[PDB]
């Protein structure tokens, strides 16, 4: 269905060195309600434009 196509602005995260790093940031993003999509097998996730700065800030504080 076309009526069900949804788009979102934001940022795609990738290039994680470890499963633990990927899941840490993925979990934090879910906790604060800004994670829109993820794929554990690729270690990627997509964060809303609104939430991106908080996720970056958390990453830089670890």
């Amino acid at each position: 269905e076309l009526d069900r196509v949804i788009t979102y602005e934001g940022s795609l995260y990738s290039d994680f060195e470890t499963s633990q790093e990927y899941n840490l940031l993925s979990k934090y993003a879910q906790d604060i309600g800004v994670l829109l999509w993820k794929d554990d097998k690729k270690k990627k996730f997509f964060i809303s434009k609104e939430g991106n700065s908080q996720v970056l800030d958390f990453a830089k504080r670890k």
Partner: protein, 63 residues
């Protein structure tokens, strides 16, 4: 470790296929295939894609 800006598009498999057809024709639309129901698209092309999908589906002479 790396982040890139884009537009996430969530859609059914048949719509994903149609957007890929749009990209093949016009280029510079799809940045990444993410999974069976998700694409990363050029943010400046989102409205184009939505309009084109509406035309493809609504103006089909076999409707």
């Amino acid at each position: 470790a790396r982040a890139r800006k884009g537009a996430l598009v969530q859609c059914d498999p048949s719509i994903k296929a149609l957007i890929l057809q749009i990209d093949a024709k016009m280029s510079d639309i799809v940045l990444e295939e993410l999974d069976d129901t998700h694409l990363l698209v050029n943010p400046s092309k989102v409205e184009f894609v939505k309009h084109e999908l509406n035309r493809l589906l609504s103006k089909n002479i076999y409707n």
